Amino acid sequence: HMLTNLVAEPFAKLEQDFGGSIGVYAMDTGSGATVSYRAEERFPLCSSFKGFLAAAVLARSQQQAGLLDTPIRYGKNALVPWSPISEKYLTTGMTVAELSAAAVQYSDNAAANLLLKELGGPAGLTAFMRSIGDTTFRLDRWELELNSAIPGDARDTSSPRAVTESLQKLTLGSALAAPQRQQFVDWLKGNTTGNHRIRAAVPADWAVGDKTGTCGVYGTANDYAVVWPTGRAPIVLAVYTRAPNKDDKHSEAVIAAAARLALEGLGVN
Ligand SMILES: Cn1c(=O)cc(CP(=O)(O)O)c2cc(F)c(N3CCOCC3)cc21
């Protein structure tokens, strides 16, 4: 409900110090109060699509009883850079559930590409997002090409608002059956790659689940989260950055600061 004006000036200052663009959308699921800053602009997803990928697998598991237990074998040529779990199981294979947990909690690229194949590719994940009423999300390519983060390129992008709206439907709404919903939440809560991003703005006594993304170019990186502050309804938020020059560096500190400003805007402790 507006509330951005409490923190609209602070966002523009943070953005000016960063030297690029910051996109934020945060929702108090109790009141429906929102904070928005560049919330409708497109930003590259980078690895952040992997959370939605795991949710799409869980949705398919509601129709296919054996799916999560299915063993998947893969060759050395499936191991693209940043595959920290799948590299340890090359000689054995992993289950669909294990690949989904690795994609979410370690951002594992081979795991992401293997689960994309299971869903019919980037268009299959895009189709899942359309099925929950997200008209903004678009995945077009696979790992690692989807990380190009070219200025003006809508491929492999969404908006902070659409990311938050979809995360709410999947973690707190009715887009997944209850058991699948709690599995998605538990995967996000167990993420290992987000300690310096939204989590850095969240007190130790609040539960949080998140998914990160880092493209490695154009100052482009992001995080989205569900946060459970004690004694009030959960908050859902998305923080995305990009910058104009290919060799601009991302900043985890800027993502944590933007998250802090979003929570302060919502009046959250
Ligand atoms: C640098 N970096 C990080 O810090 C953290 C992550 C994990 P994320 O935050 O994306 O979940 C990461 C993931 C990558 F896929 C990645 N590559 C992108 C494609 O080009 C090669 C580098 C880099 C990455």
Side-chain angles (χ1 to χ4, degrees):
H1 302 326
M2 196 43 258
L3 289 206
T4 311
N5 292 345
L6 304 184
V7 296
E9 277 187 41
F11 279 123
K13 175 45 159 36
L14 180 62
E15 172 164 86
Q16 281 158 44
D17 291 342
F18 169 57
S21 294
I22 298 172
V24 177
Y25 195 76
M27 166 196 304
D28 183 335
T29 69
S31 56
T34 60
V35 169
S36 292
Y37 188 83
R38 299 191 187 282
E40 287 85 25
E41 295 184 22
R42 286 185 174 281
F43 294 77
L45 286 163
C46 319
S47 304
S48 72
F49 80 90
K50 297 164 191 169
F52 294 124
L53 177 61
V57 171
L58 288 166
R60 178 171 290 195
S61 81
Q62 298 173 195
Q63 285 150 348
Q64 303 184 5
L67 172 59
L68 293 178
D69 288 321
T70 300
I72 304 297
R73 293 179 62 214
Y74 50 92
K76 204 169 144 61
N77 54 350
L79 293 180
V80 296
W82 202 287
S83 299
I85 304 307
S86 58
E87 64 186 15
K88 303 327 188 297
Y89 297 87
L90 173 59
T91 55
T92 68
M94 298 176 41
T95 67
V96 167
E98 288 178 326
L99 290 167
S100 298
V104 176
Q105 299 176 324
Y106 293 84
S107 218
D108 192 292
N109 275 328
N113 278 347
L114 289 164
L115 293 171
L116 277 174
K117 189 182 165 41
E118 290 303 313
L119 293 181
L125 179 53
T126 302
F128 173 73
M129 298 298 286
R130 291 290 181 277
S131 76
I132 70 169
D134 185 333
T135 54
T136 303
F137 178 102
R138 53 183 296 181
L139 199 72
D140 293 75
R141 292 168 297 173
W142 306 69
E143 288 286 1
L144 301 174
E145 291 90 2
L146 60 83
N147 296 287
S148 51
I150 294 169
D153 186 359
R155 290 178 297 171
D156 309 298
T157 60
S158 196
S159 70
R161 179 168 74 85
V163 169
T164 298
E165 289 175 339
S166 290
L167 185 61
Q168 181 187 22
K169 292 169 179 169
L170 291 164
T171 55
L172 299 173
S174 59
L176 294 174
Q180 286 73 14
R181 178 168 42 250
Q182 188 64 50
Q183 179 64 87
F184 185 42
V185 164
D186 289 346
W187 283 337
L188 292 168
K189 282 179 157 191
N191 184 33
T192 72
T193 63
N195 292 342
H196 306 281
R197 292 181 192 191
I198 294 170
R199 281 171 192 266
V202 174
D205 66 317
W206 299 1
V208 45
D210 84 297
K211 180 75 196 81
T212 55
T214 309
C215 276
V217 290
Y218 287 106
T220 298
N222 54 64
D223 197 21
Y224 55 72
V226 184
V227 175
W228 291 265
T230 67
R232 61 187 297 167
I235 298 162
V236 186
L237 72 161
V239 177
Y240 284 71
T241 76
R242 70 159 292 101
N245 303 311
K246 185 176 182 183
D247 70 330
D248 289 341
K249 302 299 179 60
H250 68 276
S251 172
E252 299 198 285
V254 166
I255 294 173
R260 284 200 202 93
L261 290 179
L263 292 173
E264 285 172 352
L266 291 179
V268 189
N269 322 118

